[PDB]
Structure formats: C-alpha cells, structure tokens
Design a protein. Structure first.
Lengths: 23, 123
C-alpha cells in the first residue's frame, strides 16, 4: 500500500457540493 | 532546520523529485480533468494526521468543497478550527481546484495543501 491515489465517490462529491455550495 | 513558515511536506522528504515528477506528469496527461493533490498537516498543528494523503480530485470541485471532504476525514469536533495553506496563504474557498492547481502546482506537477488549527502556517 506504498502510495495509493484516493478518489472521492460520486455521492461524496454530491454531498460536498450540497454542503458547500456556491453563493 | 528550516524556518517555521517554510512549508515542509513529508511526502517530498520520502520520495525523490524524480519519482514525484514522473508520477505527476503521467497522471496529468492521462486525466486532464483531474488534479493530483498532496494533503498533510502543518508541522506545528495540533490536528490529527490524515489516513490518506494523496488525492486525485475533479478540477471543477471547489476549494470549499474539497475542504468539507478533508475535514470530514479528519473527524474534528464542531467547534474545531481548520485552515488550508497553499504556497503559505489560505486559498479562496470559491476557487475551483483546477484553478488552484493551475496557479500553484510545483515542478513535479503536484498541488500541495497543508492544514492547521492555526490561521498562520508556522504557528
């Protein structure tokens, strides 16, 4: 597990866009 | 060692510049709509370390959205402070990660983000 990439899931991205939406 | 405001990433101390640049250049040519980001605690921060420190994030994710995701992973208290630093300044939360990357990536093609409980990187 030396140095893997982490990508967010689509649902995680959706939650983020909802909790920190543009003004 | 270095001054407290010189940004130090254990990632760079653990991987030679050649290895980082080969990886960063390849990932950018492959995935042009994603940006590679290293996230680490600032040396003097009294904050938990991150399990995962290497991210491939969509370029249209905002800095504030990425902050939400990173903060969620650290499992902070509702009253806790957390600040991001890119090239020693707090990045604007309304910017996209793609723009932040375009302006701030290093010669190894990584964007480096540090976090702290203090609003100044070296404090």
């Amino acid at each position: 597990p030396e140095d893997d990439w982490t990508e967010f899931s689509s649902e995680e991205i959706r939650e983020a866009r909802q909790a920190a939406a543009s003004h | 060692g270095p001054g407290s405001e010189f940004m130090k990433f254990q990632y760079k101390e653990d991987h030679p510049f050649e290895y980082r640049k080969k990886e960063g250049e390849k990932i950018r040519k492959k995935y042009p709509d994603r940006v590679p980001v290293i996230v680490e605690k600032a040396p003097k921060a009294r904050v938990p370390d991150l399990d995962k420190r290497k991210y491939l994030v969509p370029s249209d994710l905002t800095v504030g959205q990425f902050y939400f995701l990173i903060r969620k992973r650290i499992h902070l208290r509702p009253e806790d402070a957390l600040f991001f630093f890119v090239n020693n300044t707090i990045p604007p939360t309304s910017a996209t990660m793609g723009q932040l990357y375009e302006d701030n990536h290093e010669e190894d093609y990584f964007l480096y983000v540090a976090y702290s409980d203090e609003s100044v990187y070296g404090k």
